[PDB]
Structures are given as C-alpha cells and as structure tokens.
Amino acid sequence: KTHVQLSLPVLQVRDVLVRGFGDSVEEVLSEARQHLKDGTCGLVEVEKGVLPQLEQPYVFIKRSDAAPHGHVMVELVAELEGIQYGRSGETLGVLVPHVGEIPVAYRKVLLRK
C-alpha cells in the first residue's frame, strides 16, 4: 500500500530518551520510515524551544493534502542546518524514536510510504 493508517504516540519533548534518528538526512528519513513501520515512532508537537532540545537532522511529518477515517495524510521532510529535503504542507510535529515514554495523546495519520 502507498499509504498506511498509523496512530502516533505524542510525547513531551522533556520525556524523550532518544532525541533523533541518526546523523545524515538519508539516515534519519530511513530510520523514521523503519520505526513508523515497526510501531516504535513517537511525535513531538513543535513549539517555541522544542527543536533546540532535539537532535538534527530533524524528521517532520507535514500535511500532504486537505483526512480519511480521521487520519490526516502526511509525508516526511528532513531538515539539517536550515535546509529541508522535501516540500510539503504544515508541520504536524517532529518524529523521534519511541522507547516506552508515556504519551499525552495520539495523532491519527495516513503516511505516504
């Protein structure tokens, strides 16, 4: 399937134990996709002060369209030193590994895979 319905645990930035997916744009996009498939991916909602507490490169989920079955259609865009790899809509948040942190909410998305 080109799209997969996922429910992403929303984590508080200060709870996150592993603050990024790796060391290159290509690696963080790869790892993000692997964790999304394996159900081991969390989402941090971006506000003032959140991104400097996480590790670059960043992986964003961005709205790709204007929402089947409650699931917002999203795609992945990476960012490193102010350059984005991909072009998409509004940021729903920044993806991080999930290693058992308690979420505050779930974000239903339809991920372009």
Coordinates of N, CA, C and O in Angstrom, one line a residue:
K1 N 0.9 -1.2 0.0 CA 0.0 0.0 0.0 C 0.9 1.3 0.0 O 1.8 1.3 0.8
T2 N 0.5 2.3 -0.8 CA 1.2 3.6 -0.8 C 1.0 4.4 0.5 O 1.8 5.3 0.8
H3 N -0.1 4.1 1.2 CA -0.4 4.8 2.4 C -0.8 3.8 3.5 O -1.3 2.7 3.2
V4 N -0.5 4.1 4.8 CA -0.7 3.3 5.9 C -1.2 4.1 7.1 O -0.7 5.2 7.3
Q5 N -2.4 3.7 7.6 CA -3.0 4.3 8.8 C -2.2 4.0 10.0 O -1.9 2.8 10.3
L6 N -1.7 5.1 10.7 CA -0.9 4.9 11.9 C -1.5 5.9 13.0 O -2.1 6.9 12.6
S7 N -1.4 5.4 14.3 CA -1.8 6.2 15.5 C -0.4 6.5 16.2 O 0.1 5.5 16.7
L8 N 0.1 7.7 16.2 CA 1.4 8.0 16.7 C 1.3 8.5 18.1 O 0.5 9.5 18.3
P9 N 2.0 8.0 19.1 CA 2.1 8.5 20.4 C 2.7 9.9 20.4 O 3.8 10.1 19.9
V10 N 2.0 10.9 21.0 CA 2.5 12.2 21.1 C 3.3 12.3 22.4 O 2.7 12.1 23.5
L11 N 4.6 12.7 22.4 CA 5.5 12.7 23.6 C 5.8 14.1 23.9 O 5.9 15.0 23.0
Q12 N 5.9 14.4 25.2 CA 6.5 15.7 25.7 C 8.0 15.7 25.4 O 8.7 14.6 25.7
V13 N 8.5 16.8 24.9 CA 10.0 16.9 24.5 C 10.9 16.5 25.7 O 11.9 15.7 25.4
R14 N 10.5 16.9 26.9 CA 11.4 16.6 28.1 C 11.4 15.1 28.5 O 12.3 14.7 29.3
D15 N 10.5 14.3 28.0 CA 10.4 12.8 28.3 C 11.3 12.1 27.3 O 11.7 10.9 27.6
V16 N 11.5 12.6 26.1 CA 12.1 11.8 25.0 C 13.5 11.4 25.4 O 14.4 12.2 25.7
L17 N 13.8 10.1 25.3 CA 15.1 9.5 25.7 C 16.0 9.5 24.5 O 17.2 9.6 24.7
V18 N 15.5 9.3 23.3 CA 16.4 9.2 22.1 C 15.9 10.3 21.2 O 14.8 10.2 20.7
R19 N 16.7 11.4 21.0 CA 16.2 12.7 20.6 C 16.4 12.9 19.1 O 16.1 14.0 18.6
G20 N 16.7 11.8 18.4 CA 16.8 11.8 16.9 C 17.0 10.5 16.3 O 17.2 9.5 17.1
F21 N 17.0 10.4 15.0 CA 17.1 9.1 14.3 C 18.5 8.8 13.8 O 18.8 7.6 13.3
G22 N 19.4 9.7 13.8 CA 20.8 9.5 13.3 C 21.4 10.8 12.7 O 21.1 11.9 13.2
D23 N 22.4 10.6 11.9 CA 23.5 11.6 11.7 C 23.5 12.2 10.3 O 24.3 13.1 10.1
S24 N 22.6 11.7 9.4 CA 22.5 12.2 8.0 C 21.0 12.4 7.6 O 20.2 11.7 8.2
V25 N 20.7 13.2 6.7 CA 19.3 13.3 6.2 C 18.8 12.0 5.7 O 17.7 11.6 6.0
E26 N 19.7 11.3 5.0 CA 19.2 10.0 4.4 C 19.0 9.0 5.5 O 18.0 8.2 5.4
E27 N 19.8 9.0 6.5 CA 19.7 8.0 7.7 C 18.5 8.3 8.5 O 17.8 7.4 8.9
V28 N 18.2 9.6 8.8 CA 17.1 9.9 9.7 C 15.7 9.6 8.9 O 14.8 9.1 9.6
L29 N 15.6 9.9 7.6 CA 14.4 9.5 6.8 C 14.3 8.0 6.8 O 13.1 7.5 7.0
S30 N 15.4 7.2 6.6 CA 15.4 5.8 6.6 C 14.9 5.2 7.9 O 14.0 4.3 7.9
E31 N 15.5 5.7 9.0 CA 15.2 5.2 10.4 C 13.8 5.6 10.7 O 13.1 4.7 11.3
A32 N 13.3 6.8 10.4 CA 12.0 7.2 10.7 C 11.0 6.2 10.1 O 10.1 5.7 10.7
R33 N 11.2 5.9 8.8 CA 10.3 5.0 8.0 C 10.3 3.6 8.6 O 9.2 3.1 8.8
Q34 N 11.5 3.1 9.0 CA 11.6 1.8 9.7 C 10.8 1.8 11.0 O 10.1 0.9 11.3
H35 N 11.0 2.9 11.8 CA 10.3 3.0 13.2 C 8.7 3.1 13.0 O 7.9 2.5 13.7
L36 N 8.3 3.9 11.9 CA 6.9 4.0 11.6 C 6.3 2.7 11.3 O 5.3 2.3 11.9
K37 N 7.0 1.9 10.4 CA 6.6 0.5 10.0 C 6.5 -0.4 11.3 O 5.5 -1.1 11.4
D38 N 7.5 -0.3 12.2 CA 7.7 -1.2 13.4 C 6.8 -0.7 14.6 O 6.8 -1.4 15.6
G39 N 6.1 0.4 14.5 CA 5.3 0.9 15.6 C 6.1 1.5 16.8 O 5.6 1.5 17.9
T40 N 7.3 1.9 16.5 CA 8.3 2.4 17.5 C 8.6 3.9 17.2 O 9.8 4.3 17.4
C41 N 7.7 4.6 16.7 CA 7.9 6.0 16.3 C 7.0 6.9 17.2 O 5.7 6.7 17.2
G42 N 7.5 8.0 17.8 CA 6.7 9.0 18.5 C 6.7 10.3 17.8 O 7.5 10.4 16.8
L43 N 5.9 11.2 18.2 CA 5.7 12.5 17.6 C 5.8 13.6 18.7 O 5.1 13.4 19.7
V44 N 6.6 14.6 18.5 CA 6.7 15.8 19.4 C 6.1 17.0 18.6 O 6.6 17.2 17.5
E45 N 5.1 17.6 19.2 CA 4.5 18.8 18.6 C 5.5 20.0 18.8 O 6.1 20.1 19.9
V46 N 5.7 20.7 17.7 CA 6.7 21.7 17.6 C 6.1 23.0 18.2 O 5.0 23.4 17.8
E47 N 6.8 23.6 19.2 CA 6.5 24.9 19.8 C 7.9 25.5 20.1 O 8.9 24.9 20.0
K48 N 7.8 26.8 20.4 CA 9.0 27.6 20.9 C 9.8 26.7 21.8 O 9.2 26.3 22.8
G49 N 11.1 26.5 21.5 CA 12.0 25.9 22.4 C 12.1 24.4 22.2 O 13.0 23.8 22.8
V50 N 11.2 23.8 21.4 CA 11.2 22.3 21.3 C 12.4 21.8 20.4 O 13.1 20.9 20.9
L51 N 12.6 22.4 19.2 CA 13.6 21.9 18.3 C 15.0 21.9 18.8 O 15.8 21.0 18.6
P52 N 15.4 23.0 19.5 CA 16.8 23.0 20.1 C 17.0 21.9 21.1 O 18.2 21.6 21.4
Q53 N 16.0 21.3 21.7 CA 16.1 20.2 22.7 C 16.2 18.9 21.9 O 16.4 17.8 22.6
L54 N 16.0 18.8 20.6 CA 16.1 17.6 19.8 C 17.4 17.7 19.0 O 18.0 18.8 18.9
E55 N 17.7 16.5 18.4 CA 19.0 16.4 17.6 C 18.7 16.5 16.1 O 17.8 15.9 15.6
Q56 N 19.5 17.3 15.4 CA 19.5 17.3 13.9 C 20.3 16.2 13.4 O 21.1 15.7 14.0
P57 N 20.0 15.7 12.1 CA 18.9 16.2 11.3 C 17.5 15.8 12.0 O 17.4 14.8 12.6
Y58 N 16.5 16.7 11.8 CA 15.1 16.5 12.2 C 14.3 15.8 11.1 O 14.6 16.0 9.8
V59 N 13.4 15.0 11.5 CA 12.3 14.4 10.6 C 11.0 15.0 11.0 O 10.6 14.7 12.1
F60 N 10.4 15.8 10.1 CA 9.0 16.3 10.3 C 8.0 15.4 9.6 O 8.3 14.8 8.5
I61 N 6.8 15.3 10.2 CA 5.6 14.9 9.4 C 4.8 16.2 9.0 O 4.7 17.1 9.9
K62 N 4.5 16.4 7.7 CA 3.9 17.5 7.1 C 2.6 17.1 6.4 O 2.6 16.0 5.8
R63 N 1.6 17.9 6.5 CA 0.2 17.6 5.9 C 0.4 17.6 4.4 O 1.1 18.6 3.9
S64 N 0.0 16.6 3.7 CA 0.3 16.4 2.2 C -1.0 16.7 1.4 O -0.9 16.7 0.2
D65 N -2.1 17.0 2.1 CA -3.4 17.1 1.4 C -4.5 17.6 2.5 O -4.2 17.4 3.7
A66 N -5.6 18.2 2.0 CA -6.7 18.8 2.9 C -7.9 17.9 2.7 O -8.6 17.9 1.7
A67 N -8.8 14.0 4.8 CA -8.4 13.3 6.1 C -9.2 12.0 6.3 O -10.0 11.9 7.2
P68 N -8.9 11.0 5.5 CA -9.7 9.7 5.5 C -9.7 9.0 6.9 O -8.7 8.8 7.5
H69 N -10.9 8.8 7.4 CA -11.2 8.0 8.6 C -10.7 8.7 9.8 O -10.5 8.0 10.8
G70 N -10.5 10.0 9.8 CA -9.9 10.8 10.9 C -8.4 11.0 10.7 O -7.8 11.8 11.5
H71 N -7.8 10.2 9.8 CA -6.3 10.2 9.6 C -5.9 11.3 8.6 O -6.2 11.1 7.4
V72 N -5.1 12.2 9.1 CA -4.5 13.3 8.3 C -3.4 12.7 7.4 O -2.6 12.0 7.9
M73 N -3.5 13.0 6.1 CA -2.4 12.5 5.1 C -1.2 13.3 5.4 O -1.3 14.5 5.4
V74 N -0.1 12.6 5.5 CA 1.2 13.3 5.9 C 2.3 12.7 5.0 O 2.1 11.5 4.5
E75 N 3.4 13.4 4.9 CA 4.7 12.9 4.3 C 5.8 13.4 5.2 O 5.7 14.4 5.9
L76 N 7.0 12.7 5.0 CA 8.3 13.0 5.7 C 9.1 14.1 5.0 O 9.3 13.9 3.7
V77 N 9.6 15.1 5.7 CA 10.6 16.1 5.3 C 11.7 16.2 6.3 O 11.3 16.4 7.5
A78 N 12.9 16.0 5.9 CA 14.1 16.1 6.9 C 14.6 17.6 6.8 O 14.4 18.3 5.8
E79 N 15.3 18.0 7.9 CA 15.9 19.3 7.9 C 17.3 19.2 8.6 O 17.4 18.5 9.7
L80 N 18.3 19.8 8.0 CA 19.7 19.9 8.6 C 20.3 21.3 8.3 O 20.2 21.7 7.1
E81 N 20.7 22.0 9.3 CA 21.2 23.4 9.3 C 20.4 24.2 8.3 O 21.0 24.9 7.4
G82 N 19.1 24.2 8.5 CA 18.1 25.1 7.9 C 17.8 24.8 6.5 O 17.0 25.6 5.8
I83 N 18.2 23.6 6.0 CA 17.8 23.1 4.6 C 16.9 21.9 4.8 O 17.3 21.0 5.5
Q84 N 15.8 21.9 4.1 CA 14.7 20.9 4.1 C 14.9 20.0 2.8 O 15.2 20.6 1.7
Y85 N 14.6 18.7 3.0 CA 14.8 17.7 1.9 C 13.4 17.1 1.8 O 12.9 16.3 2.6
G86 N 12.7 17.7 0.8 CA 11.2 17.5 0.6 C 10.5 18.9 0.7 O 11.1 19.9 1.3
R87 N 9.3 18.9 0.2 CA 8.4 20.0 0.2 C 7.0 19.5 0.5 O 6.6 18.5 -0.2
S88 N 6.4 20.0 1.5 CA 5.0 19.6 1.9 C 4.3 20.7 2.6 O 4.8 21.8 2.6
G89 N 3.2 20.4 3.2 CA 2.3 21.4 3.9 C 2.8 21.6 5.4 O 4.0 21.5 5.7
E90 N 1.9 22.0 6.2 CA 2.1 22.4 7.6 C 2.6 21.3 8.4 O 2.1 20.1 8.3
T91 N 3.5 21.6 9.3 CA 4.2 20.6 10.2 C 3.2 20.1 11.3 O 2.6 21.0 12.0
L92 N 3.0 18.8 11.4 CA 2.2 18.2 12.5 C 3.0 17.9 13.7 O 2.5 17.9 14.9
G93 N 4.3 17.8 13.5 CA 5.3 17.6 14.5 C 6.7 17.0 14.1 O 6.8 16.8 12.8
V94 N 7.5 16.7 15.0 CA 8.9 16.2 14.7 C 8.8 14.7 15.2 O 8.3 14.5 16.3
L95 N 9.3 13.8 14.4 CA 9.3 12.4 14.7 C 10.6 12.0 15.5 O 11.7 12.6 15.3
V96 N 10.4 11.1 16.5 CA 11.5 10.6 17.3 C 11.3 9.1 17.6 O 10.1 8.7 17.5
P97 N 12.3 8.4 17.9 CA 12.2 7.0 18.3 C 11.3 7.0 19.6 O 11.4 8.0 20.4
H98 N 10.4 6.0 19.7 CA 9.6 5.8 20.9 C 10.2 4.5 21.6 O 10.2 3.5 21.0
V99 N 10.6 4.7 22.8 CA 11.2 3.6 23.6 C 10.5 3.4 24.9 O 11.1 2.9 25.9
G100 N 9.1 3.7 24.9 CA 8.3 3.4 26.1 C 7.9 4.6 26.9 O 7.2 4.4 27.9
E101 N 8.3 5.8 26.5 CA 7.7 7.1 27.1 C 6.2 7.0 27.1 O 5.6 6.6 26.1
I102 N 5.6 7.5 28.2 CA 4.1 7.7 28.2 C 3.7 8.9 27.4 O 4.1 10.0 27.7
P103 N 2.8 8.7 26.4 CA 2.3 9.8 25.6 C 1.2 10.6 26.4 O 0.7 10.2 27.4
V104 N 1.0 11.8 25.8 CA -0.1 12.7 26.3 C -1.3 12.6 25.4 O -2.4 13.1 25.8
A105 N -1.1 12.1 24.2 CA -2.2 11.9 23.2 C -1.7 11.1 22.0 O -0.5 10.6 22.0
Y106 N -2.6 10.8 21.1 CA -2.3 10.0 19.9 C -2.7 10.9 18.7 O -3.7 11.6 18.8
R107 N -1.9 10.9 17.6 CA -2.2 11.6 16.4 C -2.4 10.6 15.3 O -1.4 9.9 14.9
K108 N -3.6 10.4 14.8 CA -4.0 9.6 13.7 C -3.5 10.2 12.4 O -3.9 11.3 12.1
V109 N -2.6 9.5 11.7 CA -2.1 10.0 10.3 C -2.3 8.9 9.3 O -2.3 7.7 9.7
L110 N -2.4 9.3 8.0 CA -2.2 8.4 6.9 C -0.9 8.7 6.2 O -0.7 9.8 5.7
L111 N 0.1 7.8 6.4 CA 1.5 8.1 6.0 C 1.7 7.6 4.5 O 1.6 6.4 4.3
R112 N 2.1 8.5 3.7 CA 2.6 8.2 2.3 C 4.0 7.4 2.6 O 4.9 8.0 3.1
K113 N 3.9 6.1 2.3 CA 5.1 5.1 2.4 C 5.7 4.8 1.1 O 5.1 5.2 0.0

